[PDB]
Amino acid sequence: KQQNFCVVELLPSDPEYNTVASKFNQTCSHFRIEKIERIQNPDLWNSYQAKKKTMDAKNGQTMNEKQLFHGTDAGSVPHVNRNGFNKGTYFAVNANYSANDTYSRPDANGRKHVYYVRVLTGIYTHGNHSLIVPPSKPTDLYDTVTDNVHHPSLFVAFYDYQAYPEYLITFRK
Numbered sequence: 001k002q003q004n005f006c007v008v009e010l011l012p013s014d015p016e017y018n019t020v021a022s023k024f025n026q027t028c029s030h031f032r033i034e035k036i037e038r039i040q041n042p043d044l045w046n047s048y049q050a051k052k053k054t055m056d057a058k059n060g061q062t063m064n065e066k067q068l069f070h071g072t073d074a075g076s077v078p079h080v081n082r083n084g085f086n087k088g089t090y091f092a093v094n095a096n097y098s099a100n101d102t103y104s105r106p107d108a109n110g111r112k113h114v115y116y117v118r119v120l121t122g123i124y125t126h127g128n129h130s131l132i133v134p135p136s137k138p139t140d141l142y143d144t145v146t147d148n149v150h151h152p153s154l155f156v157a158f159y160d161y162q163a164y165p166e167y168l169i170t171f172r173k
């Protein structure tokens with residue numbers, strides 16, 4: 001219930017850093033990465049995994065999890081580290097979407113912030129612009145919605161503990 005957390009700066013020489021840096025740079029190589037940290041929130045993680053286990057048991061062969069990007073402002077970083085992303089929350093397939101100044105707002109020092117997030121996209125459908133929760137597939141609903149079902153570029157998650165902000169990327173132009 002507390003959801004306290006630790007923030008650990010990864011070594012650039014760490015394979016985990018390289019993995020995260022590399023996905024970022026598939027579309028954001030022209031930005032400069034200042035650092036990458038891992039967010040360690042035990043409580044938030046178990047709640048996330050609980051829902052994942054529940055989703056795993058219900059969606060058959062579906063690979064319910066994706067690692068997506070989320071741009072946010074500097075000030076929200078503490079709130080997200082603790083509460084995650086609890087009219088849902090939007091995640092990008094490609095980091096250059098999230099890197100836009102509208103989402104990863106540059107702070108007074110010029111730093112921009114993008115989370116590399118584990119998201120339970122689960123089973124999704126095309127999303128219209130007027131959803132508080134996902135529509136019905138009965139009364140059982142989709143897990144997320146997307147701009148395009150075959151070639152997605154963003155997802156929208158609507159429930160608590162459906163995303164974990166595993167890594168934060170601090171970077172600049």
Ligand SMILES: c1ccc(C(OC2CCN(CCCCNc3ccc4nncn4n3)CC2)c2ccccc2)cc1
Nearest residue numbers: 069070071072087090091092097098099103104129130
């Ligand atoms: C007609 C139809 C729908 C509406 C509105 O519904 C949605 C439209 C704006 N959406 C925000 C999208 C921002 C992108 N979000 C990110 C944010 C970080 C980020 N990092 N990487 C990617 N992203 N995407 C959500 C709500 C509405 C709004 C308020 C009240 C009522 C209705 C209005 C008129």
